[PDB]
Every structure is written in structure tokens, then in C-alpha cells.
UniProtKB/Swiss-Prot annotation, chain A:
Family listed: Belongs to the SGT family.
Boundaries of the shown chain within the full protein: 4 to 47 of 313
Tissue spec: Ubiquitous.
Localization of this protein: Cytoplasm; Nucleus
Role noted for this protein: Co-chaperone that binds misfolded and hydrophobic patches-containing client proteins in the cytosol. Mediates their targeting to the endoplasmic reticulum but also regulates their sorting to the proteasome when targeting fails. Functions in tail-anchored/type II transmembrane proteins membrane insertion constituting with ASNA1 and the BAG6 complex a targeting module. Functions upstream of the BAG6 complex and ASNA1, binding more rapidly the transmembrane domain of newly synthesized proteins. (Microbial infection) In case of infection by polyomavirus, involved in the virus endoplasmic reticulum membrane penetration and infection via interaction with DNAJB12, DNAJB14 and HSPA8/Hsc70.
Comment field on protein domains: The second tetratricopeptide repeat (TPR 2) mediates the interaction with SARS-CoV accessory protein 7a.
Superkingdom of the source species: Eukaryota
The protein, known as: Small glutamine-rich tetratricopeptide repeat-containing protein alpha
The protein's assembly and partners: Homodimer. Homooligomer. Interacts with DNAJC5 and DNAJC5B. Interacts (via TPR repeats) with HSP90AA1. Interacts (via Gln-rich region) with SLC2A1. Interacts with HSP90AB1. Interacts (via TPR repeats) with HSPA8/Hsc70; the interaction is direct. Interacts with BAG6 (via ubiquitin-like domain); interaction prevents interaction between BAG6 and RNF126. Forms a multiprotein complex, at least composed of DNAJB12, DNAJB14, HSPA8/Hsc70 and SGTA; interaction with DNAJB14 and HSPA8/Hsc70 is direct.
Organism: Homo sapiens (Human)
């Protein structure tokens, strides 16, 4: 498992929610993706 | 998010699903995360019929 790269991506995606200015529909899917990724890689932000 | 980066990210995740040594639970979560990112960022890698 490439844990550090996955963790970097998880941090980046969290930031997209807070500073990324995405659309509502993209935000809904992204929120789900982040929850799933934290389970997949065993690391949270 | 830049489309090029989104694509690279999803490709990395697909590779982790096949080679990351994740638990069964983690693999399922990863498969769903892929669906979600494809929808969120408007690019496809795995293209599952399951993606909503
Ligand atoms: Cl496959």
C-alpha cells in the first residue's frame, strides 16, 4: 500500500471541500469519496 | 480541481485496488470511492455500471 501518497490525496480532497469552490453535486460525491478513502487506507484527516 | 490531476488520482486508486494489499473491507470502500470521484470530477477510469 502506498499509504503516504494516499494520505496526501486524502488531505488534498478534504481541502477541495473547504477551499476548492466545487459545485453542490460534485461536493456530495466528493464527501462520500473522502469517507470511503479514509476507510480504504486506514488514515483520517 | 484540475481534470488532469483528478485522472491521475483515480488511476492511482485503481492500481491500489489491484496491488495495494488492502483488506476486503478496504477494497470495497476503495471501489466505491472510485465511483464517487469519477462522478465528482467528470472523468472515468473503472467505469462501473454501479456508479451513481
Ligand atoms: Cl480490475
Amino acid at each position: 500500500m502506498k499509504k503516504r501518497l494516499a494520505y496526501a490525496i486524502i488531505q488534498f480532497l478534504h481541502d477541495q471541500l473547504r477551499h476548492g469552490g466545487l459545485s453542490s453535486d460534485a461536493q456530495e460525491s466528493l464527501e462520500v469519496a473522502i469517507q470511503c478513502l479514509e476507510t480504504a487506507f486506514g488514515v483520517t484527516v
